[PDB]
Amino acid sequence: SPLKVAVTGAAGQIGYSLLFRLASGSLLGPDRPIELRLLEIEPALQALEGVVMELDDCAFPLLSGVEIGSDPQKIFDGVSLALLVGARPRGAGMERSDLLEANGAIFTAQGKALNAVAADDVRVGVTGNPANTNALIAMTNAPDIPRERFSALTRLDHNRAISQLAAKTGAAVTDIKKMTIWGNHSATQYPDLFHAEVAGKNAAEVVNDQAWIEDEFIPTVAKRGAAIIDARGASSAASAASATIDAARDWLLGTPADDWVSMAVVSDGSYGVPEGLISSFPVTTKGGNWTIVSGLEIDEFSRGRIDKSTAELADERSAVTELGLI
Amino acid sequence: ASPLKVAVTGAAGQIGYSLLFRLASGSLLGPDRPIELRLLEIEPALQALEGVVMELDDCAFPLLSGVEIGSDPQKIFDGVSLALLVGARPRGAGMERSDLLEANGAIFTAQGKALNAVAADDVRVGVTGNPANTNALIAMTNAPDIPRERFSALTRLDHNRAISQLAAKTGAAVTDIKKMTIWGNHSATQYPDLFHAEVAGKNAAEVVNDQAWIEDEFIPTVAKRGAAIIDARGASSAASAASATIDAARDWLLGTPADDWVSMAVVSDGSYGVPEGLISSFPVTTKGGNWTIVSGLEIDEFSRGRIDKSTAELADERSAVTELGLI
Numbered sequence: 124s125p126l127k128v129a130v131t132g133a134a135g136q137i138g139y140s141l142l143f144r145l146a147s148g149s150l151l152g153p154d155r156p157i158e159l160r161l162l163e164i165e166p167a168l169q170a171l172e173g174v175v176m177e178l179d180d181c182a183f184p185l186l187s188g189v190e191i192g193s194d195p196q197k198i199f200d201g202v203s204l205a206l207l208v209g210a211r212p213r214g215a216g217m218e219r220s221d222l223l224e225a226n227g228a229i230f231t232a233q234g235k236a237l238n239a240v241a242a243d244d245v246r247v248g249v250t251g252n253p254a255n256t257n258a259l260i261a262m263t264n265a266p267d268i269p270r271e272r273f274s275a276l277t278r279l280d281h282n283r284a285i286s287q288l289a290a291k292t293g294a295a296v297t298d299i300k301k302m303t304i305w306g307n308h309s310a311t312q313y314p315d316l317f318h319a320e321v322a323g324k325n326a327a328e329v330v331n332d333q334a335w336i337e338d339e340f341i342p343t344v345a346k347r348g349a350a351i352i353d354a355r356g357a358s359s360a361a362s363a364a365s366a367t368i369d370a371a372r373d374w375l376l377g378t379p380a381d382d383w384v385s386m387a388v389v390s391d392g393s394y395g396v397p398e399g400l401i402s403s404f405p406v407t408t409k410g411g412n413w414t415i416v417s418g419l420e421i422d423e424f425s426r427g428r429i430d431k432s433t434a435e436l437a438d439e440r441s442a443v444t445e446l447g448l449i
Numbered sequence: 450a451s452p453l454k455v456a457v458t459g460a461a462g463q464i465g466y467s468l469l470f471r472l473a474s475g476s477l478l479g480p481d482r483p484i485e486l487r488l489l490e491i492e493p494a495l496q497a498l499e500g501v502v503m504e505l506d507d508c509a510f511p512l513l514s515g516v517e518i519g520s521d522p523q524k525i526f527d528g529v530s531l532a533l534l535v536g537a538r539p540r541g542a543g544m545e546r547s548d549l550l551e552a553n554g555a556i557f558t559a560q561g562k563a564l565n566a567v568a569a570d571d572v573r574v575g576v577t578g579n580p581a582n583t584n585a586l587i588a589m590t591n592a593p594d595i596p597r598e599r600f601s602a603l604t605r606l607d608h609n610r611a612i613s614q615l616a617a618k619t620g621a622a623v624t625d626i627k628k629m630t631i632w633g634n635h636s637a638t639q640y641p642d643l644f645h646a647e648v649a650g651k652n653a654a655e656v657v658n659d660q661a662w663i664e665d666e667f668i669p670t671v672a673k674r675g676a677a678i679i680d681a682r683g684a685s686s687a688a689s690a691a692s693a694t695i696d697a698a699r700d701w702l703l704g705t706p707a708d709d710w711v712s713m714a715v716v717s718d719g720s721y722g723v724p725e726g727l728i729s730s731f732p733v734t735t736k737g738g739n740w741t742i743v744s745g746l747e748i749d750e751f752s753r754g755r756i757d758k759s760t761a762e763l764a765d766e767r768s769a770v771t772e773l774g775l776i
């Protein structure tokens with residue numbers, strides 16, 4: 124039976140990479156058909172028709188059907204996975220608050236729609252920026268969907284961190300395990316080498332260089348989005364779509380034993396992350412359910428960085444509360 | 450498995466951007482066969498290419514064993530077993546499709562020589578850049594030490610587009626559609642052949658039962674699909690062209706299903722009255738990196754007319770690149 128998958132922002136950059144991955148089998152593998160439900164805003168519908176034409180022209184055996192629309196209550200109808208990509212990208216004259224203000228209402232409305240018409244088993248992945256806060260907004264506006272069903276994307280941060288570590292250590296990405304991104308999808312994010320493993324050995328022990336971690340690794344990961352913008356002239360697209368795919372796939376199909384991934388999810392207070400925030404944690408997944416990895420010891424350096432990020436998250440929560448978005 | 454060395458030219462372009470990430474995540478060889486990407490561009494695009502590689506790196510693809518970038522085809526093609534020649538000017542910005550022949554041909558003269566000098570003995574070469582058939586003809590001719598059967602031009606997009614149209618018309622799913630054939634040139638003279646195609650074990654032309662629909666709607670719709678995409682999106686069909694490039698290479702290397710066949714523009718041995726030595730689209734089955742033209746098909750009158758128009762065009766293009774000294 125085809126999985127009903129809603130994708131918002133389907134005519135934009137990320138969408139133009141993502142839809143073809145989805146329809147070709149990148150999400151659930153070669154034996155699981157997919158129904159795509161694509162949401163856009165009015166002046167993009169024509170372009171969306173174009174995208175659908177290309178989808179048709181790929182002759183994808185797993186693509187059971189495509190519906191397009193501009194009403195979230197039509198498109199989210201009975202969907203089991205909602206990928207909320209639609210939102211404006213970061214502009215050059217924008218402060219973070221500018222983008223937060225620009226995009227939040229989207230998630231108020233979409234959270235309400237999901238609450239009204241989504242399938243009982245729905246999982247909701249939020250890619251549109253600011254990811255964490257937009258997920259908080261959607262979650263809060265869908266009180267009849269379990270709060271655990273909402274996750275903001277920090278998987279791009281996670282994969283970027285894996286890439287940087289792999290490059291530094293001369294290891295293959297398949298040798299890198301238990302990478303963690305803590306907190307916000309922003310320049311305050313904390314990539315944690317202290318619980319990661321490179322080819323079976325503690326990553327911090329392998330790289331043996333605190334000054335590298337602080338001066339090169341962390342800010343290269345944290346500011347990689349900006350670096351991509353500078354090198355390419357626009358924010359990440361194909362890699363954001365790939366990260367969206369990885370996160371949703373792992374969420375639905377489960378994480379490898381002896382590994383974990385980064386997902387921004389609602390905090391119950393674990394690791395001193397304020398309750399109610401959407402914050403990136405190390406998690407394992409099984410049967411569509413995530414579990415925050417337990418028993419980790421948080422060193423003083425890591426604690427300082429994590430707190431910096433959660434402080435930023437709390438500020439964002441206050442800001443959207445003031446705007447009346449939640 | 451040891452990483453397959455795959456060259457992709459035009460890597461910083463639109464098709465490239467839609468192609469590389471699917472290649473690196475396993476679309477070509479499946480979940481357990483790593484690949485080494487070797488990416489070729491011209492100098493003004495190298496900076497953009499760096500950005501692309503940044504994104505590739507940021508996907509942390511387990512199958513992507515490594516990436517090399519450069520502008521020297523002798524270096525980038527070194528040891529490759531698959532060369533996907535996507536690099537070439539597209540239509541637009543002062544150029545119509547007919548202008549591409551002279552604009553792009555020399556690329557393939559040069560890359561042909563490069564491949565001849567440095568590619569792995571087992572190399573297969575797929576030409577996407579337009580005009581695809583004639584560019585493949587040029588590449589093949591300038592690589593005399595590589596078997597002629599190793600070169601193929603992409604008609605798989607036409608093929609997939611025709612499958613799409615047929616499935617929509619008949620209310621069938623794409624999995625119902627078998628034995629689609631595109632004959633001839635990847636151009637407006639292409640001939641999508643419903644007479645040998647199947648819709649779930651039924652003759653496709655009979656299922657549609659409407660010769661007027663075939664001639665007046667189906668064929669021109671398939672032919673002009675690129676322009677339709679542009680008119681709708683405001684940008685060209687990069688994702689579906691990338692998808693077709695992947696399909697063709699994948700089926701070439703891994704083989705076609707036993708109940709099916711695909712379209713590939715390959716060198717003609719005179720089969721079906723297609724002048725020898727043209728790179729022309731044929732129905733083919735594939736096994737282990739080799740193609741075989743499907744034999745014994747009865748060519749009806751109408752089909753014959755259309756096929757001959759397309760091969761006539763291909764002959765004129767061959768003559769043109771011969772006059773230009775590209776072969």
Ligand SMILES: NC(=O)C1=CN([C@@H]2O[C@H](COP(=O)(O)OP(=O)(O)OC[C@H]3O[C@@H](n4cnc5c(N)ncnc54)[C@H](O)[C@@H]3O)[C@@H](O)[C@H]2O)C=CC1
Nearest residue numbers: 132134135136137162163167209210211212251252279363
């Ligand atoms: N979390 C992450 O790792 C990353 C997040 N992003 C964010 O993802 C978002 C999308 O980025 P791009 O695709 O590059 O931008 P884009 O502008 O190319 O595409 C956004 C699309 O969303 C559509 N849209 C706007 N409002 C909508 C609504 N209410 N419902 C449905 N669709 C709507 C627009 O019409 C547009 O086509 C941006 O906010 C960007 O900052 C981007 C990269 C990485």
Ligand SMILES: NC(=O)C1=CN([C@@H]2O[C@H](COP(=O)(O)OP(=O)(O)OC[C@H]3O[C@@H](n4cnc5c(N)ncnc54)[C@H](O)[C@@H]3O)[C@@H](O)[C@H]2O)C=CC1
Nearest residue numbers: 458459461462463464489490536537538539578579606690
């Ligand atoms: N056979 C088919 O079904 C299709 C063929 N095409 C053709 O594919 C070609 C590429 O299309 P797009 O990606 O849309 O164009 P594009 O302009 O976005 O990209 C072309 C890229 O090729 C690069 N390039 C030029 N000369 C090169 C050389 N000697 N070596 C390496 N790279 C080189 C350019 O710098 C550019 O980055 C065009 O010729 C287009 O007409 C396009 C769609 C379908």
